[PDB]
Amino acid sequence: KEYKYTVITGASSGIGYEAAKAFAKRGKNLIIIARRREKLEELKKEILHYNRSLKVIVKSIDLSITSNVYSLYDELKNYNIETLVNNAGFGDYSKVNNQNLEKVESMLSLNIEALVILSSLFVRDYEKIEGTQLINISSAGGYTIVPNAVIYCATKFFVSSFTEGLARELIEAKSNLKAKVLAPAAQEKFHKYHTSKQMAEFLIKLYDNDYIVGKVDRNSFKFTLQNPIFDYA
Amino acid sequence: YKYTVITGASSGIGYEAAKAFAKRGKNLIIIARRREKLEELKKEILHYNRSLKVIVKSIDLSITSNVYSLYDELKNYNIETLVNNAGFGDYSKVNNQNLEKVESMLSLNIEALVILSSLFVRDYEKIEGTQLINISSAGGYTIVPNAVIYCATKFFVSSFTEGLARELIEAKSNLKAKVLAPAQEKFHKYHTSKQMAEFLIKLYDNDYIVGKVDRNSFKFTLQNPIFDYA
Numbered sequence A: 001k002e003y004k005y006t007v008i009t010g011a012s013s014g015i016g017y018e019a020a021k022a023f024a025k026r027g028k029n030l031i032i033i034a035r036r037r038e039k040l041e042e043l044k045k046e047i048l049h050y051n052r053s054l055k056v057i058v059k060s061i062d063l064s065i066t067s068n069v070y071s072l073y074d075e076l077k078n079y080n081i082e083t084l085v086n087n088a089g090f091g092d093y094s095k096v097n098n099q100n101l102e103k104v105e106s107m108l109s110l111n112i113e114a115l116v117i118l119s120s121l122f123v124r125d126y127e128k129i130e131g132t133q134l135i136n137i138s139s140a141g142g143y144t145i146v147p148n149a150v151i152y153c154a155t156k157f158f159v160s161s162f163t164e165g166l167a168r169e170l171i172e173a174k175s176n177l178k179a180k181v182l183a184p185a186a187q188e189k190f191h192k193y194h195t196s197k198q199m200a201e202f203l204i205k206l207y208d209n210d211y212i213v214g215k216v217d218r219n220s221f222k223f224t225l226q227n228p229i230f231d232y233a
Numbered sequence B: 001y002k003y004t005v006i007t008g009a010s011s012g013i014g015y016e017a018a019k020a021f022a023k024r025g026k027n028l029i030i031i032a033r034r035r036e037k038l039e040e041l042k043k044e045i046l047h048y049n050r051s052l053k054v055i056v057k058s059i060d061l062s063i064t065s066n067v068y069s070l071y072d073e074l075k076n077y078n079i080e081t082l083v084n085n086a087g088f089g090d091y092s093k094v095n096n097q098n099l100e101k102v103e104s105m106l107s108l109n110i111e112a113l114v115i116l117s118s119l120f121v122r123d124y125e126k127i128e129g130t131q132l133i134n135i136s137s138a139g140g141y142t143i144v145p146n147a148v149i150y151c152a153t154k155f156f157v158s159s160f161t162e163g164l165a166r167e168l169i170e171a172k173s174n175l176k177a178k179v180l181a182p183a184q185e186k187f188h189k190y191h192t193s194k195q196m197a198e199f200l201i202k203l204y205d206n207d208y209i210v211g212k213v214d215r216n217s218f219k220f221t222l223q224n225p226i227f228d229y230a
């Protein structure tokens, strides 16, 4: 009607959970989507305790089923979407020769199909609305192939190339909507890693700035805003 | 009895690839939706070499359960070579793209190719002489305007196949995986389907993971993996 919402898939844990909290601290109304309804309701209670005025819509749904992706987007037609974050995803690490192919089907339906459908529907309806942003969560593994993660990385090469191509297509069309891609990287005693909260801070930095790519170097773990990486014709 | 399995064999590169492997003396399993087109191709092949075994399998590979049922059928045959060539392309701006087409593209260019590849690797990785050849595109290494989603499916195919090829090498596996990346008429360079099939045979015959046509020069080059690798 008049309120604007920030939509986050995969909001029940990890980066999406902390991303919801980061946008709530910026005073944004939220629609938070995942399978674990009880975890989303917990997140909603935390957010509203911090700021009572915010609107927070819980949507429990399995986005690995194609029909649920379209029906989710239809349920959202009554809300003015300012920002869509495609963060729902998962990863399976294995040699290809003995990988669980049902998990592969899950990585494809969620990491690729759900993200591209929601991205494309959002672009269809909001391309011309000022202030809109599409933020797709890829991975550092969407720009570097990582041993024992061949199929997962391929899904993120899809996310990164799709999002870079879309961002450049929107710019060429002088569209109001912007598209951006976040590419996070990663016993804990000896190895560098970022927390989910730190990763959400990188998401916010990507949102606030006008670079298409926000990427963590897998070697140095420095986070850098940068221009598209892939070759473009 | 060993067989060369080609998906997308009813026209274009896949059709010419079947003819090229038949000239090499290979038995074939040829797969696509149009049964009558496959049956024609069989009769042309047997007109040239009557002693070859050619198996026609009409099936829609954009349906997940069909991909698995097909591979179950293929267990009755010793597969020497699997060529994942079934695919298609849709050129559009994203904002008004037919999402039905997008779904089918995802199911065919990505899902069918990765499932058949992974099943083939599971059974054949230690079998001498075996090759997996996946058909990507020069657009799987360069993003091309008005082909954003299509290119992204081909970035998947290229990165998946490069990653798998290096994984097989590291594991000292007998199986090899390779990727082919092909690229009014009178003013613009192009390759025929027949020429593209000759590039596929070159890739098959040689010791390189990538066979790619340069988008600018249209020169075909055998080369090592292109993407960054950890």
Ligand SMILES: NC(=O)c1ccc[n+]([C@@H]2O[C@H](COP(=O)([O-])OP(=O)(O)OC[C@H]3O[C@@H](n4cnc5c(N)ncnc54)[C@H](OP(=O)(O)O)[C@@H]3O)[C@@H](O)[C@H]2O)c1
Pocket (backbone or CB within 6 Å): A009, A010, A011, A012, A013, A014, A015, A016, A017, A033, A034, A035, A036, A037, A039, A061, A062, A063, A064, A086, A087, A088, A089, A090, A091, A110, A137, A138, A139, A140, A141, A183, A184, A185, A186, A196
């Ligand atoms: N360098 C890297 O490779 C890297 C590192 C970190 C994160 N990432 C990416 O960042 C994103 C967040 O992942 P994460 O690290 O934060 O792990 P995570 O804690 O498991 O978060 C992933 C989110 O996906 C949700 N989700 C999973 N399956 C779903 C389904 N079918 N339908 C709807 N929601 C679903 C999960 O919630 P439910 O279980 O409740 O559904 C969860 O909230 C992913 O896209 C991941 O690939 C990449």
Ligand SMILES: NC(=O)c1ccc[n+]([C@@H]2O[C@H](COP(=O)([O-])OP(=O)(O)OC[C@H]3O[C@@H](n4cnc5c(N)ncnc54)[C@H](OP(=O)(O)O)[C@@H]3O)[C@@H](O)[C@H]2O)c1
Pocket (backbone or CB within 6 Å): B007, B008, B009, B010, B011, B012, B013, B014, B015, B031, B032, B033, B034, B037, B059, B060, B061, B062, B085, B086, B087, B088, B089, B108, B135, B136, B137, B138, B139, B182, B183, B193
């Ligand atoms: N520069 C480039 O980017 C470039 C250029 C050429 C080719 N390619 C790639 O090379 C491959 C061959 O394409 P092409 O040029 O030869 O065009 P094509 O003539 O359309 O060949 C595509 C093949 O896929 C088959 N097929 C399509 N949908 C199918 C489905 N659901 N189930 C089973 N089989 C299906 C088609 O046969 P049916 O209709 O009978 O099913 C046909 O045999 C594709 O993967 C294409 O992306 C890329």
